[PDB]
């Protein structure tokens, strides 16, 4: 008996889904190539692990492909990687036969019992049929934690950049080769913190600026787990520069990719279809603390939507200073959607009045958007809980529902994911209720502080974009199987505060 | 109608209490002395605010005293600040009848709608009533964001250094003076991370390190609100070096001081009685998000333990490499307590039994120690949930509970506050209901991980004491009042698994 | 609706059982072989009785045989006796065929409506299947009641020695016999305390000492029956000497064999491995005043566990001058070893609090180890229960258990085998429920007197062992067919009087 499936969100037809891999783009195919650590055996993680692969042309829809790496042992695993494409057949694999937009080479982890090293395997087909390097590895470091290369091209060395995690000492090792083959250690970075177990997943990108596309800065991507500052797993990110061999922050700071509980080992694309325009990014949607006693059957796991980052140098952290802030927007073909439904629209709502719409028959996937600004000045009140709240209640049974919304008093964009019901939500000690994130407002007019948040629910994962993606969450949510969260409440205390400008549901396919 | 009060746990008579303040210790009368942020009037944070003052010689048990600091406004408040002891007369207040020891300076931020400013106050009796510096302030660097100053004496270059916030600047500036009243700017520390939304309370003590007493690093502490990585409000620290102006961590990277939901704001003593020996520190048990919604009267809000600290630099932080950890260790005067009761003693538990002792009549307040090890090797297993349980059940009503354990899937410590009632905390959607710590073991005998925890509940409040401090989890749970969790259990999952070398606990007052 | 079975004690296929016979040894083949009271028709006592056969190898897991001795008629039956092993052939049968340690002559009461006479039976298959001697019987008459008779070896006279049971006189009559076809009669016992009462399966044996296993004494076996209104059955025995043809008492040494209220019967081996080494003995565990109404189903009655006996000629306790003292150590070998579960160990039990170890899924066979101290210091007590107590209840309805513990005041250990809502508890008016035993304590250290006791539950029979068999207590209890003691839970009066060195409870299988 199956559960309920996200729609727009990436699930492996059966088994075992964690880090996303070897992600890259064929430009004369038109064909964005997803891979994915996969365990088609049991539906919790395991050995043999291999690299899944689902194709998409909007990342949005997927097709299931065959299994694209394998491990030569049962006891060993094809661990995460990413893909480059070898235009100039730098590696002497590809013929004049394979065109140059073709050339996949996969570079992954090959984790044995015994160590951890770095293999090659290359395509002659478009990347759905993978051979290995005959003299794999093309990098040991003689240990046991020693994982997940990353990899891209740098013109003005005309080199190959491999960032990948030395892991639980806490460095992300640089190395360089032309040939590819062979790799040269060029740098080491560092104890950048919060350093919690382990560096895992590591990524190095060229960021373009907001409102200059032409600059763009350097951003270096670590995950972490165990040991994460809200519990478990997360992905932290540095802003700063790259000279070809080591990477140095603007200045010594911890930032976090994503505030909600399920967002870990994002990788971004090589290359991208601009349009889209790199760089696009896209994660796997949980947390290891309870990722594999979710109930979910046949599958377990969902990737994240792929966003467009962008550097805001101009982002209001406070009302005093501004900080370079990482910018996710989604990437979604809305496909086939609509109609609109609003409320509020160009009103200040009062306590003793609250506002509904119902859709009937949502197939549980809906987008909303939502701009609402606090009185600001002034209206005082505290020990009254001052919030604007939106609820997701029904549809075969309300009572069960995820509540969100803004609270004055704390500054903070609230989520409860509780209530109720899948007892594993009720028992499950590691399944947190409740985030917040403390998002900002983006423009002040007349004593209005003006906030907007666009969210997106999709079965069984909701997420969250403050300011056009200046702030992010991504939570998964397990309600009782079959319906709905289609009754769509807002709700406020406080008889004078909240201006909604606009609020609009619709169902999304 | 009162709530349960906890009985070690320092709170007000009634009203509001935010951060400690002034912090310092009495030589000649053996007298510890507390300071705090206090609204006698409401039960919640609000101008005019206050110095409440209290005193105790054994950190465990308090006398209430009459309020210390007032602001001049009521539209003003006296924020946060710390104490020194002008042994040598330096800022001129103190005639030759008055005793070194007892030469009390208080230094807090005077924050007013128009702007926040250092102030300074003396006292003459030895801590109890203070007066105003006449030439108040004693820096104001023309802002709204500048507060909580503390304030140490360093020896080298015979100064009093001041290191305060520059809240929404994120720069945490370093202040000297032989005088007290005249102050100059050293130097900016600096944009450090995580940011979050502000700098607040910033520490700078010499910790003596763990095995070596004679040597010692600087530490740097900095409290965030809001922005926290796991929401809401959190500490942090730094270990490096002091020269005397400038302050350097040893490698750029974030920690946090308390991983529990509930720990904020943490000020060092200025002097110790050693016995005791300094560092010693103590913090505002909650956190902002929800802190002033909890269920209490006619009070609001506890203090934490005072704790002594140290630096670890030999603290396994994973399997591979070793950190400089800071070792918190509870300070605690038991007073008078016992017996203790034990369980499975030097046993290897199975599921299929478990294990119970409720202690009929318990005030609600009691400690317990725990040293199991995981097995290791190998007992494989994964799909099932693999936890040694503590539940604290009882007393009135069971079902009304808090849960916490280990997991070996997840490698970390985990605490259930939720179930139940108490209307508060199944409608409040900041109050997280749960989070994890991942520990790490203390040594393996032969294929064996050994791990301790030492835990103490004081009827609305947990502190978890890690391998004796060197990890710390700080959160306050509210049950249904009047009763009691006394019924403690142990249980397990997977046969064979985990190994109780001990568990004791006993009743405290 | 079989009903729950003793998995360690013996007990028929089906069908009625009483007074154990023929014990003996088979060398050759390393068999234990058990004969007892058997009637295989009706589940009471009824005529034809025939004697049941089962063997075993480690006293403890058994082997249904087919019955070994059958009455000529329906009518009659055929009653209680023992058996000897002829090596040296001096009863005239066996050929040099039939090996010497396997020629096994039972002696038996051949009981009719009409006469009561002895009868021997040989056996050439080693005591499966028995012929009769064809010139029965070997003693006339009168025949007052006489039966049970127990014959031994003894060598300094060079004779077979039989001691038999003269209801009618209330004596117990010794013969001779080297022939073993005709026993000339010797002497007659004894006091004569209890007369009017009636005797019951005599026996005589050499019993070893502890701190010398060299010496022993010459001990006599009577089953004592009945007088309800009086104490009821009860096994006793006299330690004195023996010259080949008379029996002397030592005037007050004698004692009970065992304290419980079912233990009847009493028969030792004729011969024995050693290992375990003679005395050996086992008995029919229940009680001639209700033994006929127990709710077991199709069989009834167990017999008890085999006991190793031995002599503590120093023991004491009283302080008063010291005794000859009979311990009866179990024979009982454990497939299913480990694990133990255990309460407070080295730890001062208070009224406040209780223990409970919950096994789940235990079959209710079950085994306990208690090493408590009274504290002898103060603790005065007053007139108000002074007890330590154990608990068994459920599993699957608790508020029906046993409890037993010892209570300071009376000095004795109490035995609960009320609170059962089975009917034979409830409505049999003879079927008592509370016993106490007055145990010793083996060691007075300090000011804490310390107390051994070890404990068997097998379904529907407790043993108790204190001081490893100093004195003993065996009673039967019924507890609702299926579930099963397995809450086993400590409780005690008093705050500070008891002193827990050891608890620990086990399954067995």
Same mark, same amino acid.
């Given at each position: 008996?199956?559960s309920?499936?996200?729609?727009?969100?990436?699930?492996? &037809?059966?088994?075992?889904?964690?880090?996303?891999?070897?992600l890259?783009?064929?430009?004369?195919?038109a064909?964005?190539?997803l891979?994915?650590?996969?365990?088609?055996?049991?539906?919790?993680w395991?050995?043999?692990?291999?690299?899944?692969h689902?194709?998409?042309?909007?990342?949005?829809?997927?097709?299931?492909?065959?299994?694209?790496i394998?491990?030569k042992?049962?006891?060993?695993? *094809?661990?995460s990687?990413?893909?480059?494409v070898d235009?100039?057949?730098?590696?002497?694999f590809?013929?004049?036969?394979?065109?140059?937009?073709?050339?996949?080479?996969?570079?992954?982890?090959? &984790? #044995?019992?015994?160590?951890?090293?770095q293999?090659?395997?290359?395509?002659?087909?478009?990347?759905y049929t993978?051979?290995?390097?005959?003299?794999?590895?093309?990098?040991?470091?003689?240990?046991?934690?020693?994982?997940?290369?990353?990899?891209?091209?740098?013109?003005?060395?005309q080199?190959?950049?491999? #960032?990948?995690?030395?892991?639980?000492?806490?460095?992300?090792?640089?190395?360089?080769?032309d040939?590819?083959?062979?790799?040269?250690?060029?740098?080491?970075?560092?104890?950048?913190?919060?350093?919690?177990?382990?560096?895992?997943?590591?990524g190095?990108?060229?960021?373009?600026?907001?409102?200059?596309?032409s600059?763009?800065?350097?951003?270096?991507?670590i995950?972490?787990?165990?040991?994460a500052?809200?519990?478990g797993?997360?992905?932290?990110?540095?802003?700063?520069?790259?000279?070809?061999?080591?990477?140095?922050?603007?200045?010594n700071?911890?930032?976090?990719?994503?505030?909600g509980?399920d967002?870990?080992?994002?990788?971004?694309?090589?290359?991208?279809?601009?349009?889209?325009?790199?760089?696009?990014?896209?994660?796997?949607?949980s947390?290891?603390?309870?990722?594999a006693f979710?109930?979910?059957?046949?599958?377990?796991?969902?990737?994240?939507?792929?966003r467009?980052f962008?550097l805001?140098?101009?982002?209001?952290?406070?009302?005093?200073?501004?900080?370079?802030?990482?910018?996710?927007?989604?990437?979604?073909?809305?496909?086939?959607?609509?109609? %609109?439904?609003?409320?509020?629209?160009?009103?200040?709502?009062?306590?003793?009045?609250?506002?509904?719409?119902?859709?009937?028959?949502?197939?549980?996937?809906?987008?909303?958007?939502?701009?609402?600004?606090?009185n600001?000045?002034? #209206?005082?009140?505290?020990?009254v809980? *001052?919030?604007?709240?939106? %609820?997701?209640k029904?549809?075969?049974?309300?009572?069960?529902?995820?509540?969100?919304?803004?609270?004055?008093?704390?500054?903070?964009?609230?989520?409860?994911?509780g209530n109720?019901?899948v007892?594993?939500?009720?028992?499950?000690?590691?399944?947190?209720?409740?985030?917040?994130?403390?998002?900002?407002?983006?423009?002040?007019?007349?004593?209005?502080?003006?906030?907007?948040?666009?969210?997106?629910?999709?079965?069984?994962?909701?997420?969250?974009?403050?300011?056009?993606?200046?702030?992010?969450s991504?939570?998964?949510?397990?309600?009782?199987?079959?319906?709905?969260?289609g009754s769509?409440?807002?709700?406020?205390?406080?008889?004078?505060?909240?201006?909604?400008?606009?609020?609009?549901?619709?169902?999304?396919?």
């Open positions: 008996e199956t309920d499936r996200p729609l727009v969100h990436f699930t492996p &037809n059966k088994g075992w889904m964690n880090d996303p891999n070897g890259w783009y064929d430009e004369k195919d064909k964005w190539h891979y994915f650590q996969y365990n088609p055996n049991d539906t919790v395991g050995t043999p692990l291999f690299w899944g689902a194709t998409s042309d909007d990342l949005t829809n997927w097709e299931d492909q065959p299994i694209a394998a491990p042992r049962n006891d060993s695993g *094809a661990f990687g990413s893909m480059v235009y100039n057949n730098t590696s002497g590809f013929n004049d036969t394979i065109d140059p937009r073709q050339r996949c080479v996969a570079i992954w982890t090959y &984790n #044995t019992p015994e160590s951890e090293e293999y090659i395997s290359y395509s002659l087909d478009g990347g993978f051979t290995e390097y005959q003299k794999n590895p093309v990098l040991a470091a003689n240990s046991t934690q020693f994982r997940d290369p990353k990899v891209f091209w740098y013109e003005p060395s080199k190959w950049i491999m #960032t990948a995690a030395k892991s639980q000492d806490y460095k992300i090792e640089i190395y360089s080769s040939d590819l083959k062979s790799w040269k250690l060029e740098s080491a970075f560092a104890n950048e913190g919060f350093l919690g177990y382990q560096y895992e997943c590591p190095l990108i060229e960021v373009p600026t907001e409102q200059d596309p600059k763009s800065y350097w951003v270096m991507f995950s972490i787990n165990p040991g500052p809200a519990g797993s997360f992905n932290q990110y540095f802003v700063g520069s790259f000279n070809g061999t080591h990477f140095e922050a603007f200045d700071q911890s930032r976090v990719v994503d505030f509980k967002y870990y080992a994002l990788q971004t694309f090589f290359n991208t279809d601009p349009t889209y325009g790199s760089a696009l990014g896209i994660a796997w949607a947390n290891w603390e309870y990722s979710v109930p979910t059957n046949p599958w377990r796991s969902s990737m994240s939507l792929v467009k962008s805001n140098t101009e982002y209001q952290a406070n009302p005093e200073t501004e900080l370079i802030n990482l910018k996710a927007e989604p990437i979604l073909n809305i496909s086939n959607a609509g109609p %609109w439904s609003r409320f509020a629209t160009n009103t200040t709502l009062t306590k003793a009045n609250s506002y509904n719409v119902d859709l009937s028959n949502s197939t549980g996937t809906l987008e909303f958007e939502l701009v609402y600004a606090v600001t000045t002034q #209206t005082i009140s505290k020990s809980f *001052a919030d604007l709240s939106l %609820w997701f029904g549809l075969e049974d309300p009572e069960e529902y995820l509540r969100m919304g803004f609270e004055v008093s704390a500054s903070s964009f609230f989520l409860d994911r109720s019901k007892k594993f939500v009720k028992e499950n000690p590691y399944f947190t209720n409740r985030m917040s994130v403390n998002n900002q407002p983006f423009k002040s007019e007349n004593d209005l502080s003006y906030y907007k948040v666009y969210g997106l629910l999709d079965q069984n994962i909701l997420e969250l974009y403050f300011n056009d993606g200046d702030v992010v991504t939570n998964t949510y397990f309600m009782t199987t079959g319906n709905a969260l769509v409440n807002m709700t406020t205390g406080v008889d004078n505060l909240f201006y909604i400008d606009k609020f609009q549901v619709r169902e999304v396919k």
